[PDB]
Design an enzyme around this catalytic site. Structure first.
Site, mmCIF file in Angstrom:
data_model
loop_
_atom_site.group_PDB
_atom_site.id
_atom_site.type_symbol
_atom_site.label_atom_id
_atom_site.label_comp_id
_atom_site.label_asym_id
_atom_site.label_seq_id
_atom_site.Cartn_x
_atom_site.Cartn_y
_atom_site.Cartn_z
ATOM 1 N N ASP A 43 54.224 66.111 23.457
ATOM 2 C CA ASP A 43 52.988 65.641 24.056
ATOM 3 C C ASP A 43 52.123 66.820 24.489
ATOM 4 O OD1 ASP A 43 51.048 64.000 25.043
ATOM 5 O OD2 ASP A 43 52.347 62.930 26.453
HETATM 6 C C1 LIG Z 1 49.756 68.088 46.154
HETATM 7 C C2 LIG Z 1 48.561 67.720 45.280
HETATM 8 C C3 LIG Z 1 48.669 66.306 44.716
HETATM 9 C C4 LIG Z 1 47.577 66.014 43.692
HETATM 10 C C5 LIG Z 1 47.688 64.618 43.085
HETATM 11 C C6 LIG Z 1 46.729 64.440 41.911
HETATM 12 C C7 LIG Z 1 46.580 62.985 41.475
HETATM 13 C C8 LIG Z 1 47.760 62.493 40.642
HETATM 14 C C9 LIG Z 1 47.453 61.171 39.943
HETATM 15 C C10 LIG Z 1 46.510 61.349 38.756
HETATM 16 C C11 LIG Z 1 46.043 60.014 38.183
HETATM 17 C C12 LIG Z 1 45.780 60.093 36.681
HETATM 18 O O1 LIG Z 1 46.680 60.274 35.935
HETATM 19 S S1 LIG Z 1 44.102 59.904 36.023
HETATM 20 C C13 LIG Z 1 44.217 59.282 34.322
HETATM 21 C C14 LIG Z 1 43.042 59.819 33.509
HETATM 22 N N1 LIG Z 1 42.789 58.999 32.337
HETATM 23 C C15 LIG Z 1 43.687 59.070 31.201
HETATM 24 O O2 LIG Z 1 44.623 59.793 31.229
HETATM 25 C C16 LIG Z 1 43.431 58.224 29.960
HETATM 26 C C17 LIG Z 1 43.916 58.802 28.636
HETATM 27 N N2 LIG Z 1 44.545 60.087 28.884
HETATM 28 C C18 LIG Z 1 44.552 61.101 27.850
HETATM 29 O O3 LIG Z 1 44.036 60.879 26.808
HETATM 30 C C19 LIG Z 1 45.206 62.459 28.101
HETATM 31 O O4 LIG Z 1 44.863 63.329 27.061
HETATM 32 C C20 LIG Z 1 46.726 62.338 28.162
HETATM 33 C C21 LIG Z 1 47.201 61.166 27.308
HETATM 34 C C22 LIG Z 1 47.166 62.134 29.607
HETATM 35 C C23 LIG Z 1 47.346 63.617 27.609
HETATM 36 O O5 LIG Z 1 46.973 63.715 26.266
HETATM 37 P P1 LIG Z 1 47.736 64.808 25.303
HETATM 38 O O6 LIG Z 1 48.513 64.075 24.237
HETATM 39 O O7 LIG Z 1 46.705 65.692 24.647
HETATM 40 O O8 LIG Z 1 48.680 65.650 26.125
#
Ligand SMILES: CCCCCCCCCCCC(=O)SCCNC(=O)CCNC(=O)[C@H](O)C(C)(C)COP(=O)(O)O
Ligand SMILES: CCCCCCCCCCCCCCCCCC(=O)OC[C@H](COP(=O)([O-])OCC(O)COP(=O)([O-])OC[C@@H](COC(=O)CCCCCCCCCCCCCCCCC)OC(=O)CCCCCCCCCCCCCCCCC)OC(=O)CCCCCCCCCCCCCCCCC
Ligand SMILES: CCCCCCCCCCCCCCCCCC(=O)OC[C@H](COP(=O)([O-])OCC(O)COP(=O)([O-])OC[C@@H](COC(=O)CCCCCCCCCCCCCCCCC)OC(=O)CCCCCCCCCCCCCCCCC)OC(=O)CCCCCCCCCCCCCCCCC
Ligand SMILES: CCCCCCCCCCCCCCCCC[C@@H](O)O[C@H](CO[C@H](O)CCCCCCCCCCCCCCC)COP(=O)(O)OCC[N+](C)(C)C
Ligand SMILES: CCCCCCCCCCCCCCCCC[C@@H](O)O[C@H](CO[C@H](O)CCCCCCCCCCCCCCC)COP(=O)(O)OCC[N+](C)(C)C
Ligand SMILES: CCCCCCCCCCCCCCCCC[C@@H](O)O[C@H](CO[C@H](O)CCCCCCCCCCCCCCC)COP(=O)(O)OCC[N+](C)(C)C
Ligand SMILES: CCCCCCCC/C=C\CCCCCCCC(=O)O[C@H](COC(=O)CCCCCCC/C=C/CCCCCCCC)COP(=O)(O)OCCN
Lengths: 88, 178, 40, 107, 459, 128
Positions: A43
């Site tokens: 991935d």
């Molecule tokens: C201590 C600090 C804490 C911080 C916390 C931060 C917040 C954590 C929670 C985050 C919430 C989310 O995931 S926000 C979610 C954002 N939206 C999406 O992920 C939709 C589709 N995602 C993609 O297409 C990406 O490319 C992906 C498949 C992930 C990779 O692809 P690869 O195949 O190219 O690796």
């Protein structure tokens, strides 16, 4: 300092050592020219994790714009050598 | 640093950068290795649960509260590698990098020492002198009308050709010149 | 690398009939190079 | 518009001439090596050797015309005399009162 | 004194009959020789003065300024030797003639036992300077700078002539000895107020006072190097010397006529020190630093206490030497860079280490570091002003902090950091520039051993 | 819910928390393309002028010269006397002078009055 002058073969050995401990990929199938997305079915997040692992292991951090486009161990070795100015 | 940037970052790039920053700051918070591994796996789990979302409006709606949550718990004193732009030894050796052209101003008595180095230097200078004349024409004929659109340079295409604008990238002083 | 010296544009300031041109004196003409006027 | 777009006839701006390129050991004084070397010699000799050292020693050993030691000796004698005879050292009035005449007020 | 004036005059025929390739050598050698002769004047006595004749006399206030004036000329020649390489023989000889005339006028000015002769030479010092600024200047603004420098000075100094002739008509003599011995109090009247203003404004405009300093940045920026050093080192001290000479007849009016000028100087020192922080130019920054120091000297002279006068003389000499050194260093940088901008060339310490050392020493001296005479004069003026009023210490301390800040900013921006990549004509520093800096700095560290030579007549 | 980060003049809004790049429209992409285009044009010009072996000088920067001219020599010709400019000039150039004059005048008047009354204890104040 007394830091040994790390060389290309040492860098490649360290890279393969780090990769072979990543159990998501089998040590036998991997090669220095093996890909990540296609030849190993990893991935994008997995590739980010490998990049961070090499970051931690080598003591220097790779910028994101250069880290997101490294897909083979050979080009990772080449990037590290270019960063650290290795002759041979 | 090496790669030229694009006009914008795609959603995938933003997600990957946020993932890397979140993992780094989580590692900074969780000092020990086992705790870091446990909470990194938990964060990966909570990160991939929205991997397969299709609509882009909701995905852009996400990654906003994610950034706010990251900013709220960002460990105001994160770990920075010593050579990073925030590290303790960021520009420590930038005072030792003397440019190559300075060697052109050396006294002949100083040039008497290291004769072979200066001979190779003259060879490199001649190589650059011819390569520049070839490269200016190659770049002139390769660029599209109206000016370049991105700062990416083409490689060398012929046999004796060299990549355009190579002298000041090849002759960087060193990582640690002294 | 060169000391600046007046050019034509700088020299044209003193070429008028009088300094500080105004609306009334915009139509004045410098006297002829030799002090001779056409017999008309 | 067949104008030449040249405002006037002008020499191109010449490039700066490096004094080291044609003459290493250039001293930054003159392009003629002999005159240059002798200029350096006379500047260093008359600046450092003659003025900065001989003049410094001359100023250091200047005779005491400001009369500092003389003033010290006079003060020593005055203090000794006034202490031996019980006089009250320094006197409040710079000039004796008898010599001075004050206009009477009678107001 | 003629043993000094005559050789300076003979410098002109010496220069004009020299060979085309030996003018600089002869001028430098004989200027240095003249300086050695001038050293004899330094041995002043606690009594009145060295009254040479009816026309010239020397004091312990005139001696340090005279020695500095005679010493500056060789440095001016070595500084001008660089940019006059491509100049014809006649024009180089004319340049040396202007420098020699300036030195001769200053030498005749500083003794000048009579006030009208002092004024005549004090205005005579204005023609060679204007010719130098407007002829051998690079930028196109040298003409406006010359006009400003001429008119700011002349407008202030024209009422001084009327005041002097009036004083001669009433008092009967303008000889400084008679003026000092026969001095009488000035009554509080409108006529006496305007006499005070006429006698003071002519010297306050040249110092310069805050609010009349607009000519100084222009004159210092557009002038050549030699004009810059002669302006910053000696020509600024003419106003202070004249003021300390002429305040002997303005008492007791000054006791309350000094308030506007004291307030203006004590606030303009802060204003110009702050201005130095946000500057895109080096020569302008040094010029504003000179304005701040001269404002402090103005405060010291207007306080009128012995410690004030001693500190004023020490600060005069120290600031002259330091400003001359700083202008020299800026010119050496500008010759290689050809831009005159502070942030265009950076990290020069990696390429030129010895010039970095000279920069550090000059900045430290400008920073008023002990036990240099800069801090001696500074501290004397601080104590005198504290005696004048306990609240001045706030302004003086603020000025000290800002002075340190902008001095180290000037050092850091041009010396520290990473070198600029697209500059590859930074040739190694010549022996001429290193010798120039050494001859600038060594007299300061030598005078710190014998301060009494520069502490003035009230020592 | 988490407490919001309120930006100020000396602590600007982070790029990640900024909402401008989340409301993306084709004209925004076009604008970014033009920005990158002009930046790359300038970079190409600089690199062409920078790697030239024949060049032995300082690459003149029009931006730096323009900035210096705007900061130094272009202030007065664009100056106009307006109530804001006039008020600011009068205040910042007159108020401090009179404030300090009043302070010093009051202090010296008090000191002189104490001297006249003689109740100051000026003993050992020899140097002045
Ligand atoms: C201590 C600090 C804490 C911080 C916390 C931060 C917040 C954590 C929670 C985050 C919430 C989310 O995931 S926000 C979610 C954002 N939206 C999406 O992920 C939709 C589709 N995602 C993609 O297409 C990406 O490319 C992906 C498949 C992930 C990779 O692809 P690869 O195949 O190219 O690796
Ligand atoms: C501490 C006292 C020491 C006494 C020993 C005798 C020393 C005599 C020195 C006389 C003045 C020096 C001449 C100035 C130019 C230097 C020439 C040069 O280019 O150097 C290259 C040369 C060779 O090096 P290089 O590798 O070839 O060049 C590479 C680069 O140059 C790279 O260069 P760099 O990285 O090596 O740095 C150069 C170095 C050298 O450059 C300098 O900065 C030197 C100038 C420092 C003064 C700064 C101005 C402040 C005003 C002070 C005035 C005091 C003067 C007293 C009389 C002096 C007589 C001339 O700069 C410094 O190290 C920093 C100096 C800051 C010191 C701050 C402390 C000052 C006050 C201390 C007390 C003074 C009074 C004491 C009273 C009570 C005690 C009795 O190096 C030296 O020669 C160094 C000299 C030693 C430094 C002296 C610094 C302090 C001494 C000041 C005067 C002594 C007071 C008398 C007390 C005696 C007891
Ligand atoms: C030596 C060390 C450093 C010291 C030196 C530096 C500091 C001292 C020198 C610099 C400061 C001196 C400036 C004071 C007088 C200069 C004003 C001037 O020349 O007028 C040119 C300028 C020529 O007028 P204009 O071009 O025909 O009209 C342009 C405006 O858009 C038309 O404006 P508007 O009609 O919309 O409003 C004007 C009106 C409204 O005024 C106001 O907005 C507020 C009232 C402010 C003044 C009253 C308090 O003014 C009044 O009615 C008040 C009259 C009293 O007049 C103004 O624009 C300013 C008008 C307001 C005068 C304020 C001056 C008071 C300062 C304190 C004394
Ligand atoms: C490179 C690394 C270092 C190498 C160097 C090592 C050696 C160290 C020496 C450096 C400083 C150490 C301090 C030693 C000082 C001892 C000498 C000192 O005591 O003499 C001074 C004397 O020095 C001079 O007074 C100061 C020099 C004079 C200044 C004139 C400058 C030269 C002219 C150039 C033009 C000037 C331009 C500015 C005009 C004002 C003080 O005089 P004084 O204690 O009382 O008594 C003298 C003897 N008496 C009793 C007979 C009277
Ligand atoms: C071990 C010794 C250590 C100390 C050494 C000190 C040496 C000091 C040398 C520097 C002297 C500075 C110059 C002083 C000039 C002022 C005095 C001068 O004007 O006096 C004149 C006299 O000057 C001398 O005759 C000539 C001195 C000039 C030369 C000084 C020595 C160094 C010269 C170096 C020149 C270059 C040397 C060669 C280079 C190649 C006229 O005197 P006069 O008004 O009648 O006297 C009347 C009173 N009388 C009757 C009692 C005499
Ligand atoms: C701008 C950059 C700096 C330039 C130079 C600035 C310095 C110039 C300022 C002049 C210094 C003070 C001038 C007058 C001082 C006398 C004290 C007087 O002002 O106070 C009152 C005087 O009252 C009024 O001030 C009368 C004068 C009012 C008219 C003068 C103009 C005031 C504003 C003009 C400012 C313009 C300055 C710049 C001009 C270009 C006291 O009243 P009184 O005790 O009974 O009279 C005292 C005098 N006696 C004893 C001889 C009789
Ligand atoms: C950088 C620009 C600076 C400009 C400086 C100009 C201002 C200088 C101060 C005023 C100059 C003129 C003063 C006159 C010269 C002194 C002569 C004198 O003292 O004689 C007085 C005469 O006094 C006068 O005549 C003064 C008249 C002034 C007329 C000219 C006015 C010029 C401007 C005045 C205001 C300027 C003051 C502040 C200037 C600040 C700088 C801008 C005595 O008169 P008697 O005839 O002897 O009377 C005795 C019997 N009862």
């Amino acid at each position: 300092s007394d830091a040994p002058p790390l060389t290309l073969e040492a860098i490649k050995d360290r890279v393969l050592y780090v990769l072979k401990l990543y159990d998501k990929i089998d040590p036998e199938k991997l090669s220095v020219n093996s890909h990540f997305m296609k030849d190993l079915g990893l991935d994008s997040l997995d590739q980010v994790e490998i990049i961070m692992a090499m970051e931690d292991e080598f003591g220097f951090e790779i910028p994101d714009i250069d880290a997101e486009k490294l897909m083979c161990p050979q080009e990772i070795v080449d990037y590290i050598a270019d960063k650290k100015d290795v002759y041979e | 640093a090496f790669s030229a940037p694009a006009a914008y970052l795609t959603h995938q790039q933003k997600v990957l950068r946020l993932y890397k920053r979140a993992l780094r700051h989580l590692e900074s918070w969780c000092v020990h290795r086992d705790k870091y591994r446990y909470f990194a796996c938990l964060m990966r789990a909570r990160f991939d649960e929205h991997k397969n979302e299709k609509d882009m409006v909701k995905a852009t709606q996400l990654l906003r509260q994610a950034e706010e949550e990251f900013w709220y718990g960002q460990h105001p004193q994160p770990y920075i590698f010593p050579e990073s732009p925030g590290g303790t030894s960021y520009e420590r050796y930038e005072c030792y990098k003397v440019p190559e052209w300075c060697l052109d101003d050396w006294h002949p008595s100083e040039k008497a020492m290291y004769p072979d180095y200066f001979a190779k230097r003259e060879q490199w200078k001649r190589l650059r002198r011819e390569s520049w004349e070839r490269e200016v024409k190659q770049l002139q004929e390769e660029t599209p009308p109206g000016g370049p659109r991105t700062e990416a340079l083409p490689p060398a295409r012929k046999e004796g050709d060299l990549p355009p604008l190579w002298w000041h990238i090849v002759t960087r002083p060193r990582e640690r010149p002294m | 690398a060169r000391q600046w010296q007046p050019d034509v544009e700088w020299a044209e300031q003193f070429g008028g009939a009088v300094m500080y041109p105004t609306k009334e004196t915009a139509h004045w003409k410098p006297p002829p190079w030799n002090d001779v006027d056409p017999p008309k | 518009p067949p104008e030449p777009t040249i405002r006037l006839q002008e020499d191109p701006d010449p490039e700066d001439e490096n004094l080291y390129e044609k003459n290493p050991d250039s001293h930054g004084y003159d392009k003629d090596p002999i005159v240059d070397l002798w200029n350096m010699r006379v500047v260093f000799f008359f600046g450092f050797s003659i003025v900065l050292v001989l003049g410094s020693t001359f100023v250091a050993y200047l005779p005491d015309y400001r009369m500092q030691e003389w003033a010290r000796r006079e003060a020593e004698r005055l203090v000794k005399y006034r202490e031996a005879n019980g006089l009250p050292l320094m006197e409040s009035n710079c000039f004796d009162p008898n010599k001075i005449q004050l206009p009477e007020d009678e107001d | 004194m003629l043993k000094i004036i005559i050789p300076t005059t003979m410098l002109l025929p010496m220069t004009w009959m020299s060979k085309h390739n030996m003018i600089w050598i002869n001028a430098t050698v004989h200027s240095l020789l003249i300086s050695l002769i001038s050293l004899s004047l330094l041995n002043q006595l606690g009594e009145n003065s060295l009254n040479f004749s009816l026309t010239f006399f020397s004091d312990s206030l005139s001696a340090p300024l005279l020695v500095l004036t005679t010493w500056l000329l060789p440095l001016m020649l070595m500084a001008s030797q660089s940019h006059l390489s491509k100049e014809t023989t006649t024009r180089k000889k004319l340049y040396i003639t202007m420098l020699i005339l300036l030195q001769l006028f200053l030498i005749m000015t500083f003794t000048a036992t009579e006030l009208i002769l002092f004024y005549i030479l004090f205005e005579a010092t204005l023609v060679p300077t204007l010719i130098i600024i407007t002829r051998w200047g690079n930028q196109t603004e040298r003409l406006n700078a010359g006009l400003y420098f001429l008119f700011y000075t002349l407008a202030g100094s024209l009422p001084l002539l009327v005041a002097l002739v009036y004083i001669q008509n009433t008092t009967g003599s303008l000889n400084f000895l008679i003026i000092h011995y026969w001095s009488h109090p000035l009554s509080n009247s409108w006529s006496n107020i305007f006499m005070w203003l006429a006698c003071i404004m002519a010297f306050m405009v040249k110092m310069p006072l805050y609010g009349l300093h607009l000519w100084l940045p222009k004159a210092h920026v557009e002038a050549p190097i030699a004009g810059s050093m002669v302006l910053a080192a000696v020509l600024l001290k003419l106003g202070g010397y004249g003021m300390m000479r002429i305040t002997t007849i303005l008492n007791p009016l000054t006791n309350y006529m000094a308030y506007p000028f004291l307030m203006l100087s004590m606030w303009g020192m802060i204003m110009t020190s702050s201005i130095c922080l946000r500057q895109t130019d080096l020569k302008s920054l040094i010029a504003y630093s000179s304005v701040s120091h001269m404002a402090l000297v103005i405060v010291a002279i207007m306080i009128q206490t012995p410690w004030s006068f001693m500190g004023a003389t020490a600060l005069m000499i120290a600031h002259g030497l330091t400003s001359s050194m700083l202008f020299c260093l800026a010119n050496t940088n500008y010759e290689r860079v050809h831009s005159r901008t502070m942030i265009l060339a950076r990290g020069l310490q990696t390429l030129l280490p010895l010039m970095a050392t000279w920069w550090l020493v000059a900045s430290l001296t400008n920073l008023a570091l002990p036990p240099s005479i800069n801090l001696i004069g500074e501290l004397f003026i601080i104590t005198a002003s504290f005696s004048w009023s306990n609240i001045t210490i706030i302004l003086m301390g603020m000025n000290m902090m800002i002075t340190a800040l902008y001095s180290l900013y000037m050092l850091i921006t041009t010396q520290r950091g990473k070198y600029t990549h697209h500059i590859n004509n930074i040739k190694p520093s010549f022996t001429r520039e290193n010798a120039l800096m050494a001859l600038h700095i060594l007299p300061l560290l030598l005078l710190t051993l014998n301060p009494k030579m520069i502490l003035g007549p009230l020592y | 819910s988490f407490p919001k980060y309120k930006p100020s003049r000396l602590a600007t809004l982070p790029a990640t928390l900024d909402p401008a790049e989340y409301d993306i429209s084709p004209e925004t992409r076009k604008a970014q393309a033009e920005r990158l285009a002009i930046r790359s044009r300038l970079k190409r010009e600089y690199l062409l002028q920078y790697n030239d072996p024949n060049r032995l000088g300082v690459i003149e920067d029009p931006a730096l010269i323009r900035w210096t001219y705007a900061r130094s020599a272009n202030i007065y010709p664009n100056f106009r006397p307006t109530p804001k400019t006039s008020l600011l000039g009068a205040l910042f150039g007159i108020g401090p002078l009179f404030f300090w004059y009043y302070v010093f005048k009051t202090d010296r008047d008090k000191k002189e009055k104490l001297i006249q009354e003689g109740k100051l204890d000026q003993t050992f104040n020899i140097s002045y």
